[PDB]
Structure formats: structure tokens, C-alpha cells
Amino acid sequence: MLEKFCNSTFWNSSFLDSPEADLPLCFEQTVLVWIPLGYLWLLAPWQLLHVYKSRTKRSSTTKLYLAKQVFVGFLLILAAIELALVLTEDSGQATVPAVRYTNPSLYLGTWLLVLLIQYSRQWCVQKNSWFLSLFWILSILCGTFQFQTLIRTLLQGDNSNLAYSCLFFISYGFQILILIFSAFSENNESSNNPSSIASFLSSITYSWYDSIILKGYKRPLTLEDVWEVDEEMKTKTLVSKFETHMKRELQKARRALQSWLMKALFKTFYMVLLKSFLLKLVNDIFTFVSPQLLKLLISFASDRDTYLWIGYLCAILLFTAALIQSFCLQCYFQLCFKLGVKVRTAIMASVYKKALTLSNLARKEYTVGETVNLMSVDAQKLMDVTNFMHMLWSSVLQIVLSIFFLWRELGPSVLAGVGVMVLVIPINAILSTKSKTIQVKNMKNKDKRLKIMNEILSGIKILKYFAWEPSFRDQVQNLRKKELKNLLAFSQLQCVVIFVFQLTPVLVSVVTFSVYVLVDSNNILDAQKAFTSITLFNILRFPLSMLPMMISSMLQASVSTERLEKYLGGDDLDTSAIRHDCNFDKAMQFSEASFTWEHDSEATVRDVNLDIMAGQLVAVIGPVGSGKSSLISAMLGEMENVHGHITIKGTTAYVPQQSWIQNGTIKDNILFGTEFNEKRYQQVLEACALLPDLEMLPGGDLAEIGEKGINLSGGQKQRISLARATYQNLDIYLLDDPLSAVDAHVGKHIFNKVLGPNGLLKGKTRLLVTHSMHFLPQVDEIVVLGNGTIVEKGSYSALLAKKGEFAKNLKTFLRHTGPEEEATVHDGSEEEDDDYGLISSVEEIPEDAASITMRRENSFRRTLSRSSRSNGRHLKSLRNSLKKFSIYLEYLQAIGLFSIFFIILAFVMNSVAFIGSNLWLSAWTSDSKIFNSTDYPASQRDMRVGVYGALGLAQGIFVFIAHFWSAFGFVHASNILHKQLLNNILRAPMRFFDTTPTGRIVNRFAGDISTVDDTLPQSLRSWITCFLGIISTLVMICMATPVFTIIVIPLGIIYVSVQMFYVSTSRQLRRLDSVTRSPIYSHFSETVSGLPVIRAFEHQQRFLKHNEVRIDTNQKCVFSWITSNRWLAIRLELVGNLTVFFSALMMVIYRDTLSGDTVGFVLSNALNITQTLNWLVRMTSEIETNIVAVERITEYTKVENEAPWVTDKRPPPDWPSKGKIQFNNYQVRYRPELDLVLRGITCDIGSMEKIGVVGRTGAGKSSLTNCLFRILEAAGGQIIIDGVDIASIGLHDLREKLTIIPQDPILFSGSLRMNLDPFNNYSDEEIWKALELAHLKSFVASLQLGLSHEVTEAGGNLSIGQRQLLCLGRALLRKSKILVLDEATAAVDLETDNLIQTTIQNEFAHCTVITIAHRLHTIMDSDKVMVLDNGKIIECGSPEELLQIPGPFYFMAKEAG
Template sequence: SVFCPCCPQNDSYLARPDADLPVCFQQTVLVWVPLGFFWVLAPWQLLPMCKSRAKKSSCPQWAGPLSSQVLATLLMLTAVAELALAFVEDAEQDAVPAVQYTNPSLYIATWITVLLIHDARRFCLCRDSGVLFCFWTLSLLCGILPFQSLVRKALQEPISDLPQFILFFISYGLQLLLFFVSGFSDVAPETKEIGKKNPEVTASFLSSITFEWYSSMVFKGYRKPLEIEDVWELKDKDKTKALYTAFEKNMKTAMRKAQAELEKRKRKKRRREGDPDHGNNMSKAQSQDILVLKQPKKKKKKGNNEDSGPPKDYARGWLMKTLCKTFWQNLLLAVAFKVVHDALVFVSPQLLKLLIAFVSDKDSFAWQGYLYAILLFLTALIQTLCLQQHFSLCFQLGINVRASLIAAIYKKALTMSGATRKESTVGETVNLMSADAQRFMDMANFVHQLWSSPLQIILSIVFLWGELGPSVLAGIATMVLLIPINVFLVAKAKTIQERNMKNKDERMKIMTEILNGIKILKLFAWEPSFEKRVNDIRARELKNLVNFSYLQSISVFVFTCAPFLVSLASFAVYVLVDENNVLDAQKAFTAISLFNVLRFPMAMLPMVLSSLVQTNVSTARLERYLSGEDLDTSAIHHNPIAGRRTFRLLPLGDLAVLLPQPSCLCSVTLDITPGSLVAVVGAVGSGKSSLVSAMLGEMENIKGHINIQGSLAYVPQQAWIQNATLKDNILFGSELDEARYQQVLKACALLPDLELLPAGDQTEIGEKGINLSGGQKQRVSLARAVYSNADIYILDDPLSAVDAHVGKYLFEHVLGPKGLLRKKTRILVTHSISFLPQADNIVVLAAGAVSEHGSYSTLLANKGAFAQFLNLYGNQEEDVSEETVALAGDEEEADEDIDPCMEEGSGDVVTMTLKREASIHRRRLSRSLSKKSTSSQKKAQEEPPKKLKGQQLIEKEAVETGRVR
């Protein structure tokens, strides 16, 4: 041959005692297979590195891959020597086969490419390539046959071509060294710091496929119990922020398409309902009347415990599309590993068949047995590695899906409109985060069994047909008979699961109410009543779970027995149908091996179908929840106004919490200049809190817009406290500036409280600030906003929860003209009239509209609603002047308790008047209640008791003493 060395044509290379293959085959196929693998994947390895190199060209070089580069350079020199030797031999002798020119040239190009990859790693701080590791492995495996052939020939006879012999072993030895070097991860010093936080980032390819990087965590857990500080950080791509960003982008696209489909369905439905009923010539109005008359009967049949269910008109089918589009790379890679594993699963029985035939045939050569054993080992090894990588990807997929769904639910709970919020409960939201998101995680772990299990079952039957012939039909018939049982069990399981999720929503709702009002429950001794309600719902849940467990147990039992029943039926029919059919060792072991392959997919399939049913229910619940309407934030603009930071509330028209209800704010027009203090006052129900919600964009906007320049800080009327230290509550994720931090503590009057707390600002504050008083919680909330250093502060009556002297101190040192926020824009909603003279502008609200606004003196001079409001307080003070005389002594004692360092100002008279008024109001309310109680008791004694139908005593309460906990 001109291309490669000639070889005898009559030799059978499989029927000889040695394992030598033709020289032409060794120099072509065994060389080109690993090179072809490398050249197919090398461009995909270089392109990302080139992009990364352009971004990180300023990174310093590091000496990590230098050893690999030196070895690759030596390999290139070896290839050059082979090419030069071919030219020398061609000049001295006859024509040299072309393969001796082709192979060295291909090797030279390959080693240069390897050097480029290692050079890119030096500049890009990339870890070692899995492509190179696989290439070295494949090259060494393909070189085993030429290696053993040359060694055996050298032992039997003198070496004919010594230079080629030496160059081959030098090249093979260098490739073996590169294989070992690539098994270790050489990382840059910069990357090592990242590796300390997460070793997976810097793990080599060999460490990744064997999970060796996790060994340190296993040893640490063996030595001592693991704590949260021992857990490594997540990779950037696995963090919730990165996951949800991609998920939200795809979700919006898929949801828009689903909403369009929904509108199309609604239009078709309206057109159908608009046509008259041709069957009975009945008009639409008549049919509606009949439906209304029949509706109570339908409700009666459903029973009292059944819910009407979620509305049917919502966007459907978009959630699964979103998940597939977001995590398609993970899905495809898991599919690739699963395909390789499933293919190798059916290779093992065939190798076992050949190995049994080798043992039975005494004329077989020994090298065949070694070959079958090595192939069985390699098949099992690759099969195990692929399966573990597949499950690792599936578990990562499940966790990422769960994190994305929880983030989407959490954000939806914060941004949903009032109408949508009315349709869902807190219990349902919590249940969606915990139970429904977990369903998706469980399903993602084994989602590929939906196609893999049927594929394995079909291939197993095909191979069994080749072994047992038509007798396999008996086994197939047995499986077909089991399908209706599975269909029935799945349908019943779906019904039970839907019913159970409703019970779980109701239980979560009641538990949330109990935990939020546990103090009231303890004071009124309502624990038995609520405990009974929770136990009743839990009993229904447990009943459904028991029924579901029964169904699942039956399903698992049937499909666990299925492989045995299939094999029993197949073997029985095979032996009984023909006397010549004998189950020898080869046929029996091969068939049993295939039946074992059949066992796993048939055992997993019912579990996956059961999980699919649960996920289908959760999909509908999540799609209904996430496709609800959000608050329209398009009315909030951030356009610059005259080059300054300004808060402008242009004519809004109507703003409402729920659109079907009457509007809460009408025709509000405000223009707030920077650095000013604006007070918002008005009677109860005049719309002050609604105005704050409108400024924050939490109300439905019908017309108009809001223009905000700068950052916002909001202090609610009811303080929100995290379960963290007091310092963390104030910093709220911001960097610590010790000087500013101390300044904020002093201005918010928190320094005396730090002396009382056991650990100062490091004191752990309980859930919802349970170990702080109301005033302390409010001051912590105010300190958090002040420390944020925002441009605009919206304060919803933050001084109502503190004492009068503390409120005055906070106003002077934080909110007032000389306070810490004097250069900031402050919008203060307040009921205290003592601070109004110091406000730059006062907005008076009445019946959801701005009655008037201006400075304090201007509003008094106008004698409008604000003046009437102040005169009303003055008249009330004159009416109760006689009753306040009796309280004078108590008030004087209270004044003595005030911190003497506080300065007395003009607002003290008003504050003391308001305190006296509140005290008298409470006394009057107590007297009126006692009078009403006395009159009602007399009336009850005079009138005989009336027996009303349907009324009964639900639960008699008894007072217990001495057992308060």
C-alpha cells in the first residue's frame, strides 16, 4: 500500500493466540480517533478562552500550567523528529508510506493547539480543561495495543527500526505524564482565594467527575458536627440573584404569550355565549336566570367543606416553558450523560454473554478473556461516572428551580395589586414557597426518567426478544395488564393531592394567625378553641395522606413485583412452548441481566408519575398566583426637574387600593422642594396613609404621575424589626461608618437604651422586636432610615409610639430645622400639632383630597380647614377644663419624671393638653361602657330569654387562676 505499510491478506487477526492488530490499522484508526476527538472539541475550548482573555488581559501571568507546557513542547519536538526521520528514510530508501508523513504533521498541529490552550489558561486564570484530560485518556487507551505489540516483538526478535521504536516510547511516556499532570488542578493565586470559599470552582476535571473536591467536607463532618460557617459559598451562577434574573426574563416573555392566548380564549367564549341557544330558542338572559336558580343546588351538593376552587381564567402552560428555557443547558447535559449511561447498560449483558461463551469454549484464546474483562470494567466505570454526573446535575437543577420559584413568589407577594392580594391568603403564599416549590424540586431530580424509563423498557424487551423469542410477549402482556391499575392509581392520587393542598393552605393560614396573635390567645385562653380548629384540619390532611400512602404503596408493590412477574411469565412460556428450548447458562444469565435492567425503570416509573401528578397540581397553583396583576409602577417617574432633586406629585386624578372600591385620593397636586420639611395632617380616615402609599407606588393609579428625584427612605407607623442584632437592624446591609453610626445613635436617643441592653448594640433582637418596647422599636426603625443617608424621607407618624419628651428630642435632633436631616427632604405625617409651626409647608387632607397647603402662618390667616382644626382642639380644651383640674397633681408628678436635660419649649403646653385630653377621653369611654353594661344587664333581667333557631353554645369558657405562663 502507498499510504500505510502492507500486511498479509489471509491472516485472521481474531483467530490467533496474540492480540496484534494490522500495522495499518494501528497507524491510522488508533491514531486518528483521539486526534479527531480533540479537533472536534478544541475550537469550543479556545473560543471562550479568547473572549475571557480579552476581558482579563491585565491579569498577571502565573506559573501553574508551565509543567504542562514543557511536556507539550517536548511532544512537539518528538513529532518534528518523527517527520525528519521520515524524510531521511525516504531519501535513503524506497518510497516511505504516506502515513509516516501524515501522522507527525497532525501531531505537530495538535501539540501547537495544546500549547495555545495552556497559554490561554495562563492569561485567563482558567482551570484545566476536561477536553484535554479526555484526549490524554483516549490517546493512552488507543496506544495500549501498539505498545504491547512493540514490547512483545522486542522480546522475541531484534528491533528492526530502532529510531521509530524509541520515539514511540518517548511520546507515549510524555502523554502518560501529561495525563497525570492534568488530573491535578493548577490554579492561580487569585483563584486560590476563591477556591477557599468553594473548592468546586478550582477543582480539576478528574476531581469534578469523581467528586474528590468534596472529601474535605466529609472529613470535617466526620470529625465534628457541621455548622453553618463550615458550609462553602455558592458559585456565582448558582446564587438566587443570577438564577432569578434569567428566570424573570423568560417568565415575562412566556407569560405575555400565555396572556395573549387567554384573551383569545375569552373572546371565543364571549362570542359563543353571545349566540342564542338554537336548541330551545332561549335567550341569553333566560339561560342566565335558570343558571342562577340552579346554582344553590350545586353548592348544596358540594358540601360545606369544599371550596369553590380557584378561578379558571388565568394564563396557563407558561411555567414549564419558562423553566425549560431557563435551565435548558442543565437539562441537555443531563440528557447526554443519561443517554451514555442507558446505552452502556445494554452493553454489559452482551459482554457478559461473550464472557460466558469464552468460558464455555475451551479453544478460545486467553487474550479474549482479558479483553472482555477489561471492557466490562471500563463499561461499569464509565456507566457509574455518567450516572453520578447525571444525578448531580438533576439535583442541582432541582435546587435551582426551587430557588427561582421561591424568589418569584416572594417578589410577587411584594408587588401584587390589591385585587390580586384579596384573592390569596398568607397561608397560601407560605404554602407555595414551602410545599409547591418543593414539589418541583422533587420532580426535577428524576424528570429524565419520564423518557429514560420507557426507553429502557423498550430496549430490554427488544434484547429479550433476541434471547427468548416470542416468549417475551407473555412478559409484555403482564406489563400491559398492569397499566390500567397504574392509571387508576394516578387519577385517584391527583384528586387526593388537590384536596390535601387546599387543607394545607387553610392550616397555614390559621397557624399564621395564631403565631401573630399568640399573646391575645394566651390572655383570653383561646388555645383550646384554636387547637381544635388546627387539629380538625390536620386530621383531614392526615386522612388524605394516609389514603395517598395506601395508593402509593399499592403502586410500588405492583411495579416492584412486575419484573419478577414478567421474567416468570417469559421463562415459563419459553420452556413450555417448545421442548427444544433449554435455559442454558448463557441464555439464562443474559436474560436475568436484562430483567435486572428492566427492574429499575419499572420501579421508578410509578414514583415519577406520582410526583408528576403532584407537580401538575402545583403548576396550576403557581401559574394562577404568579399570573395575577401587579401594581402599575409606570406612573412613577425619575425625570430631573430644573436641575434639582425634587419630589413632585403631579395631578394624579384618582388613586385607589382596589379599583372596584371608591377612590381614596382625588386630584392630588403637590410640589415639594428639596431640603424642606412638609407636614401632612388631617382627621382619621382623611387619606394620609393612602398618600404615603401613593408616593411609594403601592396604590392603583388611574391617571397622573409621580416624579421623584433621589433615593427614598420610609419609616412606617408600625416599626419593622429583623431577627438580628440591634446594630445589624440599623446598618441593614450598609457598610459601617463608626462616626456616623454613633451620631445616629445619639440623635435617635438610643445610647441610654444600649446601656440597659445586656450586650449593647450586639444584643440579639427577637422576631418582630419582641424584647424591645414600642418606643425602642420605633427609634430603631428611625435610626435605620437616618443611617441610610437617603435624599427623601417619608415618615408615617413615627413619633406616635414614643413619649412626649422623647418625641420632642427626636424632632429637634433628627427631623427639625436643626436636626440631623435638616438638609434632606422630609415628608412627615403627624397628629401632633406642637411641631407644625416649625414645618416649612403643611398639607391638610380631608376626604381623600388636599384641602389646603402652605406655611403655618398662612393657613392660620386663611381661616380654612386648618384653622378650624386647631380651633376645634381649643374648644375641646375649654369643655374639659373642669375635669382636668383633678388630674393636675398627677401631671405634675409625671413632669418630674422627664429628663431634666430636655429643653422646655412652646410646644409643651399643647403636648400636655393633648395628654390630658387623651386621659379624660379614656375615663369618659370607661364610664359610658359601664353605664351601657349596667343598662343591658337590667334589660336582660326584665325581658325573658328568647330562643332562636339554630343558636347553640359552642364552647363554655372557664376562668383559671394561678396557671398563667
């Protein structure tokens, strides 16, 4: 056939098996040419059909496009001229071969298609494509054999066919220029993201992403510098696609009632997974093509007769094997994890949509925490199962295929070797469940220290008054003792679990080799049959060592997925009872509607019938719990129907009993996403009397409101909530108790200006439900609700004339009273820090994946423990009155320097046994060539395994002492680190606490300490063991080939530059990731608090729009660091591959002296470089991130300090004896940059003198008390007490002798007794004596547990007056000579105030009392009165002396009666 076609042979082994293997000619230009030619003409319709489907506008012709187009035009000229010569040469009566002129014809036709495709390539978004990029690269490789064939023939003094060669030479020359130009990608200015613009070669090598990383290396990143993620991954598009199949599956699920979500995703995403399933096989096949190539290459160096060319081909094929394997692998991770974010984006938005539509009956079971738990953890769990769908089938594929290779290779002895691998899993199982048992048991102890520390932080000042800090310092330290005892057992578990994982590849190598050489047979070992095996086990572990992990994960996902089904599959609210009419004569009407909360429960509203005209003012009243708040719920549609219907017209405005507020500004909340109209905006503020309050607020209307309005008083929240309703200008207004929390005068103002017959809402229908009675005469009609039914209705005069139950209840509760509340503080805290980032999937980097598995559970448990609280903050505006190398060095300083320098020695001395084992094993394999069959002595040639076993156990003992010893260092470091914080922040000045909101201190003492002893300890063991493994293997490569160490330098510099750029960018994206994720959780928690409000204004669509862009703002960055993470392996395995691919050439070209065994180790473990060298940078990323916790620890542990608690000049034990107080020109300031609040007070307090202090607010009255106890240190002047200066005495030598009754009663969680006597210095009868004196004996005895009764947080289980009375018992307990009162009766009823006051003159007559009170009559009994204004004393005299003088005290007394 082809013999006559070429007048030459097809191919023969004679041409092959030669020292210079020359590929037969005719086979070249007839077979290999048919590969790219056949590649084009078959798939050519597929591309043009695909392009013709999507026709667009043509793009501008860049000079680059003209360049690659005309170059192909030259190729046609190339085809033209060469076709001409063969026809002319045929005139010489020579029968030219058919291939000579048929080859151009094929080229002639095919290049026109290239012109056609290139010309048509303009319209597509992608200026290049795989169908072209692969064609050029395939043509070069498939034309390379022709290239080397032509050159060698012509070099041997042959120029007969020179014309064909040179034209072909330049023909090959132009093809490569096409590729180097086609691979280049031009920006068409169409899309911000180069993802749709980058050429195919850039799409794999990720050269397009260099823009971000290069930009990141210059200046800190920002949200706008990260592009929005394409058009496909738009959350709205994702939601619509998923929900279509979701509802269909739900409908079929309903039919089964006479579980689906995992099926639903497959029905929708089967296209995406296929692109990875077909690709994952290509990966696995090329993982095993290397060890097969090892056997060929190792055998090459065994004997000398091998042709030189086989070595180079093996080396080159080794190179391309990795590149194909590398490209698909990263094209797999990037595609698979793109699904990982894709799936979560669907459910996270989908659950939000279902949230606004669920029936409240379903919500009656879930709290606020449970609903957000779906996205906090349950949605997050759906990534990990999704992050490995292909791994469930891949893992079983590798293990069985690996067995087949080794079983065919090594023999039926590895069953024990793979057998011991199987038996590893039971150890991993038992240790894992033991670890889980103790860590969850550690949480209960962990949260206790957190809760205990919340209450001390809130009331640090109160502790400073009495100096209880040593008691709490030992209390927390004692609690920390139970922390480490559980922790050490946990850490001792982790060193064992990493032991079995790390040791097993060595152990199996010992067992597998020992058995084969020692079975009763003539068994020989050599390099080729040994070194291929060890590579297989390196491949084998990862699919097998992770096998228990996904099984746990699948069960872990099983509980999570079911919770989603019960939520999403839950029913929706039934709005059929609510009828919306546009022509109904009334605003609203009842039609015998009976409503019940639960279908099995009784009806809360029974057969009630009303009818309200449009624009009327109607009042609905009734006893508490009669169903008043329930009737309004019927209007909202949240109330279930039994029978009847309701007709409502127009938009409705609603205000709940408990005000719901959003996060933002006051202007934003009232605006509610509408349009700002200033004239209405000013009118509504005046009408709702918000003007006096915004003036009080420092930021005015633009002031940021705290979460749930903690920055705002409860009474105000009702006013803004009502003000929000007024701005909307709706039709129906429902006013569920809008005036109870406001003042009577303000209630008069809001009614007249908004609600009354002169209000802004005169023309609108208004339904008010109120508890007050004075506004009813101004109401058009009054309805009374009784027992869920209406009793009487009519006008105020008619109901009064009827003498009904309203008249009976008219005389009773004429007024209802109710004071106001004050709150003017801000909360600054952040708890969004994580420890799992940078790793989306376990298979990303599997060297030691046991570490990352614990991180997922560690992060899940801490985010599940959402229970956290504070106590209070009275009126502080911001802080005002008037209410790299060295850090790790320090870290390792905490670790015992003795231990740290030997555990590192153990790791390095672990490696020498590792490297010796491989070294000496190579010498063992030399036995095969030097010994004939049955020539080895059975004893002295089998003693080798004894050495291997000894070094095998050396691999264990060396690292057993390493990991186990590191456990002690880690727990010891955590102890000394934790002591440093408690020894300082407790000792830290309160001025530091003044400028620092408690939120930072809470998270720093909790979040940072949590990771430093849990996450960081596991990551360090990871980092050294990989680095030393790398150093061990290259230091072995260098001794085998000394030339290698020279070529390391170019590889070293490129590597360190790459890792520098990534850590300079990947570090920032994590912080940006955290700051955008928390609003999503915050937003959901924000809206779920106010669902009944949302359907009232029908703004459902706006929130979906609002959430749709917020989640996009988040997921646009998580996708942006996945590519950066993928950016490594492509640009770093090309470093890993060259350091192993180059090795092959040096061994090949040094074959004249190396042996067969020598090339084994230098190349065997060299295949472990790629998958482990990249593991190094991944750890380096986390270390540079998680160390910021230690950064933040160092900042707080170096803060300032007060004077020592105890000084050398201790006071006499009886001191104070008289309680005399002397002030001399005393000046202080809150901060050095702030002005002097106190301005030189000089006063003398006689013994046994009662002094009351009066003055305006913030006149230093509270400051002076702080000065007495030395909270604010002396800026100038001094205080002398009983002839002794307090400056020279320590704080703990003076604070025990003085007593204060604080205005704010902060109490300590625990028993009653510890709240009174934490030091246990007094007996129970003395405590009982104090309680009866404080008049608490009846109440405390009434408690079931008596003096041991538990105290809730901030004393939430006790009333305000009791807490004043309880702290009064503290003063009676101490019996200090000096007593100070500072607004102790602000929130005390007059009865208890008299009781509190009575306890003063009787039990404190023999003590000096300083009283500060806004209540003047409480000071009339004081012997002396101090008037403090603007930091100075103005008047000094007795109350009767000051009353006669017309001064500020007389004026204040005039104001107070």
C-alpha cells in the same frame, strides 16, 4: 492495495480463528494507528481556534510542564533515530515496504502538533483537556495490540527486526509516562476552586474533590472552607441571562390577548440540556452492552472447544463497558443536577425582583404566606421536574429496546411477562391516592395536638398552680389515639405498596419462564437463553416502575408553574402619576388628583389640592378612616391614579402607621445600611429619647431584635422607626401618627428635639399627621381632611378664628390618653429541620424510589402548615426574676423485641428462598444438555415450574409477613415513645422550663415525633432489604468460586473507609444547608412586611445586592454536596466493578471444572451490585442524620422530676380546716448556681387573717407565692400549715386545696366550660352561680353558645378585664380555705377593680387571703402588712401601726398619696 503496501495480507479469518489469536501485522500499523492520528489532525483546528479566541496572560512554567514537554522531545528523538535506520538499511538493494518509512513521517508531523498544543496549553485555564487526555489513552489502547503482537513474534526466536521492536518498546514506554503526567494536575494559583484547575482525568474521577472530604474527616466544616461556585454560576449572571428571554416571551404573550415559562427556560438553556441529551444515549447503549456480553460469556463456559482468548476479551470488554457507563452516568447526574440548582437560582432571585415591582393591587389578593409559598414549595417543585427532563424520553427508550432484545432472544411469550408489569401500575395508582387521602386527613388531627400543646407550654406555671395536668395528659393521649388509628391504616398501606414493587421481578420471572416452557411446542430452556432474561428485567423495572411517578409530578408541577405565571406575569405599579422634579418651587403639590384603591371602586381621595413650601411644618388631621393614612400612600406611589398628577422634589422619608422593623440590632436598623457617624448617632438617640430604653435593654444598641420586634414594645418601635428616618437626612419627611404610642412627656420631648421649631429637622420639610391636638399650635399650618376632601386649611389661630368645624371639633376630644406596653423577653426556636435532603432526583438511586416520593409530599405538607403561635412572656431577661450504639438499642427497645427479632428473621429467610430459587434454577437449565429434543418427559421435566411457582410464592409469603408485621412495630413504637415524652415533660420541673425557651420544646415534641413515625419507618425497611440482598448475592459468589472470599477483604476495607469518609462529611453539609436556607425565606418574609417603606427610601438596589450574596451563600453549599454525592459512584463502582469484573477471570481460569450454568448466577445478579451497593450508603447517610430526632427524644425523656404527686402520707379530707400558715427560716434559690433570692423568712399567719405584701419589685413577693405552692423547692427551712409540714405531702395532694388568681390571664382554647371545670366536677348551675358572682352572667348569656362558647388562643376573643373576671370565677368555684392574690388588678379598670375587690371581702371572708399588689389602697383593708425587701421581711404590723412609724411602708404610702 495494501497487499503491495506491506508485502503481506490485510486480515484473514485464518489468522483470527486460532488457539492463540494473532492479529495480522500490517493491519495493526496501518489501520489502528490511523485512529489517534486521524483523531488529532481533524480536531486540531477546533482546539487551537477555541484557545486562540480566549487569549490571556501566560502562566509560570512549573517543573511538571517542562517534564512532560521534554519527554515528548525525546519522542521526536525516537522518531528521528528510527527514520534514519530504514534509509540506511535500504542501501542493501532491498525494496523496503512503504509502511516502514511512511509510518515515521506521520509520527514526525503529528508530534510537532503535540509540541504546539502543549506549548499553547499554558494560556488556557485548564492545563489539560479532553482533546489531549483522550488521545493518550486512545493511543495506548490502540497501540496495545501492536505491543502484544511485537513481543510474541520476537519471543519465538526472532531477532531480525529487534531494532524496531526495542525502540518501539521504549516508544510505548514514554507514552504511558506522558499520560500519568498529563493526568496529574498542577495548581496554577489562579482560582480558589480546583474545578477550573483539575485535569480532565481528575474532572471525571473527582480526585480534586478529595481536598474537601479529607479536610472534612479532620475537623468540623465551616462556610469559608467551601469555595464559591465558579464564575458562571453567579446568581447575578443567571438573573440577567434569564430575564432577557423572559421579558421577550412575556411581550409575545401580551400579543396573544387578541403558559410561557417552560418555553422561556428552553429558549435559554437549550445548550446545557444538549450536553446531557447526547450523553444520555451513550449511557443507555452501554447499559445493554453488558447483557449482550453475558450471552457471549455464558456460551463460552458451555463447551470446552472455546479458545482461551475469547474469555479474557469478554472479561476485559465487560470491565471497560462499566467504566464508560459509569463515567458518563456520573458526568450526567452532576451536569443535570447542576442545572437543577441553576434553574431554581434564577426563579428564586427573579421572583424577589418582581416582588419589589408588583402593583399593590395584585398584592391585595396574596397574603404574606402565599407570596413566600412560591419559593417555599413552588420553586422547590421546579427542581424535581427539572431533575428529570431526559427521563421522559429515556424511560420509553429502555423499555422498547429491552423488549427487542428479549423478544429476539426468548420468544413471543414475554408479552404476558411485560404485560403483568403494565398491570402493576393500576395497583400503584389506587394505593397512592388512598395514601394521599388519609395523610392529608391526618394533618387536621396533627395540627390540633400542636396548637393544643402551644398553649399548655406557654402557661405551664399556671397549670402547676392548679394541677390540671392529668386532664391535659389524658386529653392529648386521647388525641393521640386518633393519631395512630389513621397512622396504622397508612402504614398498613405502605407495606402493600412496597410489596408490589419488591415482589414483581420475581413474579414476572415465574410467569415468563412458565409460559414459554408450557406452550404447545418443543421449547427448551438453558443458561444462555435464561440468565440474560433475568438481567433484562432488572434493567426494565426502573424505567417502568417510575413511569406513574413523573406523570404525577408533571401534573404536580402544572399547578405550581401556573401560580408563578400569574405572579411574574402580573402588572407592575404605575408611577406615571408621581412626577419627580428638581426645579419645582414647592416641596410637593396636588393637581386635582383623585385616587382609588380599585378601578371599579370609588375614589378614596377626591380632587384634593394642596401646596406645601420647602422646610415648612404642616399638620394634616381628620376623623378616623377619612383617608389620612391614604393620602400619604399617594406620596409613596402605591396609590392608583384616576386623574391628576403630583410633583415631588428630592428624597422622601416615610414612617408607617404600623412600625416595620428588620432583624438585627437597633444600631443596624437605624443605620439601614448607611455609614455610621457616631456624633450624629449619639445626637439622634438623645433627640429621639432612645437613651433611657437602650439602657434598659441588656445588649444596648447591639442587642439583637426579635422577629417583628417581639423583644420590643409597640411604643418603642415607633421611636426607632422615626429615629431611622432622621438618620437618613432626607428632604421630605412623612410622619403618619408618630406619637400616639409614646408618652405625652416623651411626645413633648420628641417634638421639641426633632419635630418642633427647635428640633433636628428645622430645615427640612415635615408633614405630620397626628391624632393629638396639643402640638397643633406649634405647627406652621394645619390642614383638616374630611370624607376624602380638605375642609379647612391655615394656621392654628386662623382656623380657630374661622369658628369652623375645627373649632367644633376642638372642644371635643381635647386629649386622647393611651397608656404604654412592656415586653422584655427573647424567643428561641428553630423549625428549619428537613427530611428530604441528600436526594435531589428520583433517578439518583432507584432501588426503592417509592420511599423518597412520599418524603417530598411529607416535607411539602409540613412546610405548607406555617400556622404556629405562642401566648406571651412577661419580662424574663434571660431567666431572671423580677418580672451512638446504645441509642438505636433504646429505639428498638420501643419496638417489641419479640417482633424485631422475627421480622429480621423473615428478611434473612426471605433471602434463602431467593438464593435457592436462583441456585435450583441453574440445575434446571442443565436439562437442555442432558436431554435431546423431545426426550424430556412431559410431566417429570415440567414439574420444575411447580417448584419455581412454589418458591415464587415463597418470595411473597416470606416478606408479606415481614413488611406487614413491621407496621405494627412502628405504630407501637411511636405510641410508647410518645407516652414517654408526655409522661416526663409534664412531670418535668419548671426550672427546666425556666432555662429552656419554649421554642425548643415545641419543635422537639412536634418535629421529631413527626419524622420518627413517618420518615424513619420507611427508611429502615429500605436499609435491611438492600443489605441482605447484597449479602445474599456475594455469599452465593463465594460458594461458586471459593477463592473469591479471599479477595473480598481488600474490597471490604476500601469500601468501609469510603463510606466512613462520606458520612463524616455529608452529615455536616446538611446542617450547614439548613441554617443558610432559612434566612432566604426569612429575608423575603422580612421585606414583604415593609414594601411601602422600601420604595420610600429607594434602596431597592441594595436589597437585590443583599439578597444576591445571601442566596449565593446558600447555593454555594448545595452544589458542594452534589459533587460529594457524585464522588461516591465513581469511587465506589470501581469497587462494584472490580468485584464483578474479577469474577469473570476466576471463572475463566477455573473453566476446567465449572459448567455453563454455574457461571450464570454468579455473574447475572453480579451486575446488580453496582446500582444496589451504592444504594446501601445512601440509606446509611439518611439513617445517621434522621436518628438525631431520636437523639433529641432521649435527652428530654431523661430529665429530672419533682416529688411524687401523691405520697403515702395523705392529708385529712377536711384539711386545710383553719388555713393557719407558719414560716420557719425559709430560704430558696432559682438555680443552684444562683444566689438565694429568699433569705430566711420566719412568720406566722393566723387563721382568718388578711395579709397584704408590699415591697420593691422582684423582692421575692412572687417567689413567696411560688414557695407556698412548692414551685421553688426548699433550699432551707420549712413551711408548716395547720400544724402539718407541706414537704412530706405530695404536690397533687396540696395544690387542689389552695387557690391563686394570676396576674397574667392565660386561658385554654376550647369551650368556656372546659376553661372553668376541665375535670367536670361541678354542675352548670354551680358554674352559672360562679359567673353571676363574678358578674359575667350577662356577658356569657349574651354569647350565642353560652357556656359552650369557644375560646380563641390565649383568650384573644375576650377583653383583659373579662379574663381577670373569668379567672375570678375559678376561685369562687373551688372555695379553698387559702386564697392568694398577686397583682391581680394590674391591668384592670377601676370599675372592675372595685368589682373584683368587692368579691374578695364578701365571698372570701371565711378564707385566708394573701394579697400582693403594687396598689396600696387595695392593701389598706388587709389585717396585716408584710414588707419584703431583698428577700427579707423588715416591718410586721397593722397598716395603722406601720403608717405611724416612718418606715419604707410609710414612705411608699407617702408616694401613693
